[PDB]
Write a protein that binds this DNA or RNA. Structure first.
Ligand code: SF4
Ligand SMILES: [Ca+2]
Length: 344
DNA sequence: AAGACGTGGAC
DNA sequence: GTCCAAGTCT
């Protein structure tokens, strides 16, 4: 019923599509940015970030020419920062190697950093009309119900099957709207919980509904870490911060010098990292910060700084009124907030 | 394959 | 507490 189905989906879409910021046009650059921001992130959260992001970097050229620090700052608080570092580099690549024109060939576009099987399909089909499937968790949730599939969507290979299913039923006469319509359905109707099957435009074609299992689909299958953090201030008002390693957790983001005490190292633990010297005091407070794969149990230690040498390594000395210029993980934003209300 | 990789918000 | 939401990389 490919053609019939395609009609009920696309029709519902034409009359129900939300007017979101990135839907004002089909500009490749803007679709690409939005698609990256939306990955594992709530639309309500992305909206403000996209509008601020595009206002700051209006075109692919603007983003390519910006310093990663300014870009990380624009991404501050969105999470999975590796997404923007991949995007930045891909945009630089497009500019220099492709003449600032986003490749419209899957094989060419897919080679860019951050562009996986979903993003190639999403960006090329919405912005160029290239008939490629754009399968992500949303699309897999929808198709697993329409075609009652019990394959764990967490399995690497499961996606390939759903992509096959899309190549099969896709409306080649307008893939962009077909791909985008599947996502809207998953977002507005066929939701994770309580899918609104009774008002669904493609209910007639749904196997999961016929069997009354729509709500059990799709089928889908952390370490605790004590962290010691020190807020160091000059007899003048400056504080010590540093730029995290360029690989791994919160890469290239700034933070207050910290140390994984993986136990009860304590104030002395951070002290050992003084090897430029200073001393600390009692812990201002302790709180937890969760990640997808771990939970940081942080403890903040106030301390005074006394200049006895240069400031090298990743370290950097910054005036209180200059901190708002660096991108800090949310956990360190609270560290500093705690510090400020403590002293105040 | 399976685990790294953030965050604010419904239940 | 749980489970996230329009994945990608290794
Ligand atoms: S009927 Fe229900 S489960 Fe089936 S596609 Fe519509 S909303 Fe999804
Ligand atoms: Ca790729």
């Amino acid at each position: 019923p490919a053609r019939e189905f395609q009609r009920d989906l696309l029709d519902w879409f034409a009359r129900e599509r939300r007017d979101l910021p990135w839907r004002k046009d089909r500009d490749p650059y803007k679709v690409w940015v939005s698609e990256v921001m939306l990955q594992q992130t709530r639309v309500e959260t992305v909206i403000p970030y996209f509008e601020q992001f595009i206002d700051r970097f209006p075109t692919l050229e603007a983003l390519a020419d910006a310093d990663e620090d300014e870009v990380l700052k624009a991404w501050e608080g969105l999470g999975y920062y590796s997404r923007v570092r991949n995007l930045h580099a891909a945009v630089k690549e497009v500019k220099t190697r492709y003449g600032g024109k986003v490749p419209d060939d899957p094989d060419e576009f897919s080679r860019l950093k951050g562009v996986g099987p979903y993003t190639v399909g999403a960006v090329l089909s919405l912005a160029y009309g290239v008939p490629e499937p754009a399968v992500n968790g949303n699309v897999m949730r929808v198709l697993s119900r329409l075609f009652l599939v019990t394959d764990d969507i967490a399995k690497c290979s499961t996606r390939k099957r759903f992509e096959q299913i899309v190549r099969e039923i896709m409306a080649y006469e307008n893939p962009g709207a077909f791909n985008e319509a599947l996502i809207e359905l998953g977002a507005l109707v066929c939701t994770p919980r309580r899918p609104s099957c009774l008002l669904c435009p493609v209910q007639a074609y749904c196997q999961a509904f016929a069997e009354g299992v729509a709500e059990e689909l799709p089928v889908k299958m952390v370490k605790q870490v004590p962290l010691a953090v020190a807020v160091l201030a000059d007899d003048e008002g400056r504080v010590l911060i540093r730029k995290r390693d360029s690989t791994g957790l919160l890469a290239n983001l700034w933070e207050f010098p910290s140390c994984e005490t993986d136990g009860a190292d304590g104030k002395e633990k951070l002290e050992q990292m003084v090897g430029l010297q200073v001393e600390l005091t009692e812990p201002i407070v302790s709180f937890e910060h969760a990640f997808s794969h771990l939970v940081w149990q942080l403890t903040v230690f106030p301390g005074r700084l006394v200049h006895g040498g240069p400031v090298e390594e990743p370290y950097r000395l910054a005036p209180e009124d200059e901190l708002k210029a660096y991108a800090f993980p949310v956990s360190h934003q609270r560290v500093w907030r705690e510090y400020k209300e403590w002293a105040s």
